[PDB]
Design a protein around this ligand. Sequence first.
Ligand code: Z3F
Ligand code: NAG
Ligand code: NAG
Ligand code: NAG
Ligand code: NAG
Ligand code: NAG
Ligand code: NAG
Ligand code: NAG
Ligand code: NAG
Ligand code: NAG
Ligand code: NAG
Ligand code: NAG
Ligand code: NAG
Ligand code: CL
Ligand code: CL
Ligand code: CL
Length: 340
Amino acid sequence: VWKDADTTLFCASDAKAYETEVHNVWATHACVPTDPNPQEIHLENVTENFNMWKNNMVEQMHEDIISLWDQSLQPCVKLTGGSVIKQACPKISFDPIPIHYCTPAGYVILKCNDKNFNGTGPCKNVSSVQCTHGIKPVVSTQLLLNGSLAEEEIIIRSENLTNNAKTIIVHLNKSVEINCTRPSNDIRKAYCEINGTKWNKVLKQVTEKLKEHFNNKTIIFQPPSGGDLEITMHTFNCRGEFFYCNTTQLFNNTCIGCNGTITLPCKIKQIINMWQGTGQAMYAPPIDGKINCVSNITGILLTRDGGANNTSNETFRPGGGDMRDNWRSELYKYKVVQIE
Ligand SMILES: CN1CCN(C(=O)N2CCC[C@H](C(=O)Nc3ccc(Cl)c(F)c3)C2)CC1
Ligand SMILES: *[C@@H]1O[C@H](CO)[C@@H](O)[C@H](O)[C@H]1NC(C)=O
Ligand SMILES: *[C@@H]1O[C@H](CO)[C@@H](O)[C@H](O)[C@H]1NC(C)=O
Ligand SMILES: *[C@@H]1O[C@H](CO)[C@@H](O)[C@H](O)[C@H]1NC(C)=O
Ligand SMILES: *[C@@H]1O[C@H](CO)[C@@H](O)[C@H](O)[C@H]1NC(C)=O
Ligand SMILES: *[C@@H]1O[C@H](CO)[C@@H](O)[C@H](O)[C@H]1NC(C)=O
Ligand SMILES: *[C@@H]1O[C@H](CO)[C@@H](O)[C@H](O)[C@H]1NC(C)=O
Ligand SMILES: *[C@@H]1O[C@H](CO)[C@@H](O)[C@H](O)[C@H]1NC(C)=O
Ligand SMILES: *[C@@H]1O[C@H](CO)[C@@H](O)[C@H](O)[C@H]1NC(C)=O
Ligand SMILES: *[C@@H]1O[C@H](CO)[C@@H](O)[C@H](O)[C@H]1NC(C)=O
Ligand SMILES: *[C@@H]1O[C@H](CO)[C@@H](O)[C@H](O)[C@H]1NC(C)=O
Ligand SMILES: *[C@@H]1O[C@H](CO)[C@@H](O)[C@H](O)[C@H]1NC(C)=O
Ligand SMILES: *[C@@H]1O[C@H](CO)[C@@H](O)[C@H](O)[C@H]1NC(C)=O
Ligand SMILES: [Cl-]
Ligand SMILES: [Cl-]
Ligand SMILES: [Cl-]
């Protein structure tokens, strides 16, 4: 017996001692070691309701990642609303590791094992756990990288598909590799390579799944309509450097003579509109040498256009900005309950 409840969670890592990587340091002092014997209990003939868009676990992970970045990626200057906070900005080692989220004594986490679960409503194959799985806290926009995959069909996640202000999260069932490099000695010029055949097959599957959700209206893809740069381009952190990569060849190279390698131009930016809170951070120029990260695109952040009620189309643009949807894309299958 149990009921929905919220409590202070704790985290669990496989952080290594002596390793200077920032996630390792943070998790070494802020998390416990992984449960070496983690036990799950299937609950026979139990249906439990979940809401991924209203889940306090999301906000707690968010607060954790804010604190991590606050202690690790210190910008040279931070213009944080009139304030000019100055400090050192040594180049650090940066590579996210999996974090587990665990309930204290008296509470438990319920986890949905429905292979079709969209994050909202009833779940029929429920199990009980003490900790989530290892979730890498990957900050990104437009594309979710290095996450899990849907176990069968592509899942569409939204708090309300008919409300165009509510973000759509696409959960892919087959990752697509994005391979990004800034070559060794424009020091801020970089680029990302993606397989065109794989990308366009995945995007065609995505449009047809979307067609299932919008009475077979024609699904159109377009790039963002205004933003700060962090939203209009695919923005991520690779080895401590902030990459901004133009993706109109992803959402506007129709191919729905193009089955080859897509190259997206990129810039490493020093001034950044932060995601942790409104304000500006200025870091230092990129490190010397080859800067490379090979990531899996495992989900997409989308926003549907409004005012197409009286049209036969629905146009979607890549989105992002609020990283709680990033954590939501992995925490969707979890919810905390107080055990009575
Ligand atoms: C709610 N809360 C308020 C303040 N916020 C904001 O004002 N934003 C507007 C400008 C862009 C912001 C962003 O996403 N920055 C970013 C920076 C680095 C990386 Cl690697 C990245 F992937 C993304 C979103 C955040 C949301
Ligand atoms: C429900 O999910 C659990 C967890 O993996 C597993 O036993 C199986 O996939 C499902 N059980 C049944 C009886 O289908
Ligand atoms: C990328 O995807 C492949 C296949 O889906 C998977 O085996 C691999 O673990 C993924 N890479 C990372 C870094 O998660
Ligand atoms: C992914 O899901 C789609 C459904 O939209 C399905 O047609 C496709 O076969 C799936 N791909 C894989 C690799 O399972
Ligand atoms: C998710 O599934 C529930 C129950 O099947 C349904 O009510 C809800 O509309 C679905 N959400 C989406 C976005 O498809
Ligand atoms: C979803 O959005 C539509 C459009 O604004 C609204 O009519 C509907 O009430 C919303 N659903 C819920 C559950 O609030
Ligand atoms: C990624 O891109 C670089 C530069 O084109 C290339 O050397 C490398 O082989 C590519 N693939 C991987 C897996 O790094
Ligand atoms: C992209 O994936 C397809 C299979 O979907 C494969 O035939 C092709 O070789 C891949 N691209 C490259 C550059 O190898
Ligand atoms: C969508 O189109 C398919 C064609 O494969 C058709 O069978 C189905 O009835 C249509 N459904 C809606 C909701 O438009
Ligand atoms: C991305 O590149 C295209 C040219 O291919 C350009 O029209 C567009 O303005 C670029 N995006 C941004 C945000 O500048
Ligand atoms: C892509 O959309 C942009 C608007 O951001 C526009 O500049 C361009 O014409 C479109 N691409 C193609 C290939 O038409
Ligand atoms: C994604 O995971 C790979 C494998 O560990 C890593 O090399 C890459 O840097 C990661 N990408 C990001 C953006 O963290
Ligand atoms: C568009 O239609 C949906 C329901 O089909 C409704 O909830 C929404 O308010 C409408 N928007 C406008 C601007 O008429
Ligand atoms: Cl423990
Ligand atoms: Cl404890
Ligand atoms: Cl933007």
